């Protein structure tokens, strides 16, 4: 039958397709050689007269179909990319040749009688307009394309958005505007608060990935003079001010039926906001899927395509399938690299989480059940990349930690008026060796959880903070005096991990990155934090009034 495709046809070589309506044959990963129509370089006109450029892949037959859409500024005609040698840890990513990275593959969706629309947002492709990534103005353009699509001859009126990374962030954005024909959304790993999630971590500027990403956009469209200079924006907006508030999606405006993917493996880019989107969305019908595996690999994996399709068959085809039997949260409890167990819950944060303090003791590198009665101080050189302080707890029984963790420290410094603190959670096996996990950006020597804070940014938003997840206002800098001892709470980003009986959790605090390096030597694919306020010794106080502690989310 037709899902085996037609092996008599030759696949359309994608760089040879010309503008207009084309009959093409797609090298589908699932369904062999698949005939369809591709309309290349169609335009949609914005309210201000700007044209946005798109491709439309649709069944070669009359009729009305549900529509799958994605939008970004990376190039709508990108042929997906010696990657095996150049970025070996990307994992297995099977797609047709008509799938720009992270996009819904028309070779999967179109044979299942969906239309796929690929949108080049303003400033990209033949548009030389303003390119302001992850903004409301970009969201407004996306909204126009959704509503236009709903009125086309091949459209059943129901548009669902889908895609990874930039293609996910733009969904949080457009959904906050509630387009009337946006009937479902699949933000598969996307941030939605640039200040907190990519431009700065805990107030410390990302000098790596953020800048690499920004430069990449500039390099992609060198003949567009209207690309927003986000390098300079980072320099001149060090606090969460009116500029950055406009780059935090108003998530509680979202009402659209929602399938979110978050990953334990993307801490430092999409992880925080993936969870924020799921949590804060007002949507009455929402689901979350969490894994501790690789990003694009998991998106394109057949089981996750089938999950996406089941959600869209319910919402876009209006089929009475059993989608709503799906538990609202499905999550991996990671044990080792690519080894874990998937479990389910009715909510995130997990309704059975017991937020449990472990108190730090500076004298003996321990985390403890009981409070430490007398105040002591530990110390590390903040400029020596080999120095840190660490604290360990060995479990007496199998324990699952799933959710946020909060590291409360009392700290001071003598040689600077500020401190950059780098926190990490590690798991050590029964032999005392670190157990590595997938981590950002597609590194395999990562850790359990990571967090950051610039201490002048420590002031908490009391309304938004919780016992497991501190929320920092980032409104004003509270610089320090010599030996001013201050309380800080560091956001360890959401993680899911089993600690077996005999295994150890280790907190590490340091003046620089805890896990070093990346998976693409010479290219800044990972966060870096090379612009630091650190000088000299950092002090960490524990015991007595200095109730330094780690709050851990014990579940199951
Ligand atoms: C190697 C090329 C860099 C990859 C760019 C990633 C952009 C993204 O994740 O949205
Ligand atoms: Cl449920
Ligand atoms: Cl225990
Ligand atoms: Cl939690
Ligand atoms: Cl806020
Ligand atoms: Ni060929």
- For the chain, the domains span 12-195+248-349, 196-247, 350-513+540-556
Q: How far is the CA of 326 from the centre of ligand 4 (A)?
A: 21
User: DSSP string spanning 235-251?
Assistant: HH--SS-HHHHTTB--G
What is the C-alpha separation between 196 and 464, in angstroms, rounded? 14
Strand runs labelled E in 59-165: 65-72, 115-120, 155-164
Interacting residues of 125 by C-beta distance below 8 A, sequence separation 6+ = 53, 75, 76, 77
Q: How was this structure determined?
A: X-ray
* CATH fold label, 196-247: alpha-amino acid ester hydrolase ( Helical cap domain) (1.10.3020)
Q: Which ligand is nearest to the CA of 195?
A: 5
* CATH fold label, 350-513+540-556: Jelly Rolls (2.60.120)
Architecture of the domain spanning 12-195+248-349? 3-Layer(aba) Sandwich (3.40)
Three-state DSSP class for residue 32: strand
What is the C-alpha separation between 478 and 314, in angstroms, rounded? 51
What is the C-alpha separation between 40 and 38, in angstroms, rounded? 6
What is the C-alpha separation between 41 and 56, in angstroms, rounded? 9
What is the C-alpha separation between 170 and 173, in angstroms, rounded? 5
Mutation pick for ligand 1 pocket among 75, 166, 220 (CB with most ligand atoms within 8 Å) = 166
Q: Which two tokens stand for residue 526?
A: 């990972």
What is the C-alpha separation between 127 and 123, in angstroms, rounded? 5
The DSSP H or E segment spanning 496 is: strand 486-499
User: Is-contact 278 258, C-beta < 8 A?
Assistant: yes
Mutation pick for ligand 1 pocket among 188, 214, 216 (CB with most ligand atoms within 8 Å) = 216
Burial 179-209 (b: 16+ CB within 10 A, else e): bebbbbbbbbbbbbbbbbbbbbbbbbbbbbb
What is the C-alpha separation between 102 and 266, in angstroms, rounded? 15
Angle at the Cα of 70 from the Cα atoms of 67 and 74, rounded to 5 degrees: 155
The closest residue, in CA terms, to atom 8 on ligand 1 is: 165
Angle at the Cα of 64 from the Cα atoms of 62 and 67, rounded to 5 degrees: 125
What is the C-alpha separation between 484 and 419, in angstroms, rounded? 12
- The structure tokens 């007595």 sit at 544
- Exposure on the CB side of residue 498, measured as CA atoms within 13 A: 18
The DSSP H or E segment spanning 275 is: helix 271-280
Please state the atom number of ligand 1 nearest to the C-alpha of residue 166.
10
Q: 257, exposed or middle or buried, with CB in 10 Å at 0-12, 13-18, 19+?
A: buried
The closest residue, in CA terms, to atom 7 on ligand 1 is: 213
Tell me the angle at which helices 271-280 and 166-175 cross, rounded to the nearest 10 degrees: 20
User: Is-contact 194 170, C-beta < 8 A?
Assistant: no
Interacting residues of 67 by C-beta distance below 8 A, sequence separation 6+ = 114, 115, 116, 117, 149, 150, 155, 156, 158, 159, 160, 316
Ligand 1 binding pocket, CB closer than 6 Å: 87, 165-166, 213
């Amino acid at each position: 039958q037709h899902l085996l495709g037609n092996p008599k046809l030759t696949v359309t070589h994608v760089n040879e397709v010309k503008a207009g309506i084309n009959h093409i044959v797609v090298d589908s990963v699932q369904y062999g050689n698949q005939e369809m129509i591709m309309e290349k370089d169609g335009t949609v006109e914005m309210r201000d007269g700007e044209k946005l450029y798109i491709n439309i892949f649709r069944p070669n037959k009359d009729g009305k179909f549900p529509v799958v859409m994605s939008a970004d500024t990376y190039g709508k005609d990108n042929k997906p990319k010696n990657m095996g040698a150049l970025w070996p840890t990307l994992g297995t990513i099977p797609t047709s040749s008509f799938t720009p990275e992270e996009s819904p593959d028309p070779g999967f969706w179109v044979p299942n009688d969906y239309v796929v629309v690929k949108v080049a947002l303003r400033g990209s492709d033949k548009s030389k307009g303003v390119l302001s990534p992850w903004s409301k103005r970009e969201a407004e353009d996306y909204y126009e394309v959704i509503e236009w699509a709903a009125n086309q001859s091949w459209s059943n009126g129901n548009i669902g958005t889908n895609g990874v990374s930039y293609l996910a962030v733009t969904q949080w954005w457009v959904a906050s505007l509630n387009p009337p024909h946006l009937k479902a959304m699949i933000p598969w790993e996307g941030l939605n608060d640039m200040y907190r999630e990519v431009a700065f971590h805990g107030g410390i500027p990302d000098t790596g990935f953020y800048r690499f990403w920004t430069q990449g956009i500039f390099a992609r469209w060198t003949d567009n003079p209207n690309i927003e200079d986000l390098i300079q924006a980072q320099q001149e907006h060090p606090l969460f001010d009116d500029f950055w508030k406009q780059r935090q999606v108003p998530l509680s405006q979202i009402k659209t039926p929602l399938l979110t993917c978050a990953s334990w493996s993307t801490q430092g880019l999409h992880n925080r906001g993936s969870f924020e989107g799921f949590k804060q969305a007002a949507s009455e019908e929402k689901w979350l899927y969490v894994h501790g595996r690789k990003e694009w690999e998991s998106y394109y994996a057949r089981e996750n395509l089938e999950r996406q399709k089941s959600f869209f068959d319910f919402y876009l085809k209006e089929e009475n399938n059993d989608w709503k039997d799906t538990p609202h949260v499905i999550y991996e409890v990671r044990d080792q690299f690519y080894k874990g167990e998937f479990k389910s819950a009715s909510a995130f944060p997990l309704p059975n989480a017991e937020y449990t303090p472990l108190y730090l003791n500076a004298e003996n590198h321990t985390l403890n059940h009981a409070k430490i009665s007398s105040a002591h101080v530990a110390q590390y050189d903040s400029e020596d990349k080999q120095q840190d302080v660490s604290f360990k707890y060995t479990f007496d029984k199998d324990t699952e930690l799933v959710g946020n963790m909060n590291l409360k420290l009392w700290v001071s410094t003598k040689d600077s008026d500020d401190m950059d603190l780098f926190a990490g959670i590690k798991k050590l096996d029964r032999r005392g060796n670190e157990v590595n996990f997938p981590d950002f950006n597609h590194i395999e020597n990562g850790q359990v959880a990571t967090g950051w804070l610039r201490v002048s940014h420590r002031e908490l938003d009391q309304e938004k903070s919780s016992i497991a997840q501190p929320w920092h206002k980032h409104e004003t800098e509270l610089k320090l005096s010599q030996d001013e001892i201050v309380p800080v709470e560091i956001e360890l980003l959401p993680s899911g991990t089993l600690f077996k009986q005999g295994e150890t959790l280790e907190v590490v605090v340091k003046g620089s990155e805890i896990v070093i390096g990346n998976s693409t030597p010479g290219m800044k694919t990972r966060y870096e934090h090379e612009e630091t306020v650190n000088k000299g010794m950092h002090m960490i106080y524990t015991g007595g009034k200095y109730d330094s502690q780690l709050i851990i989310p014990i579940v199951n």
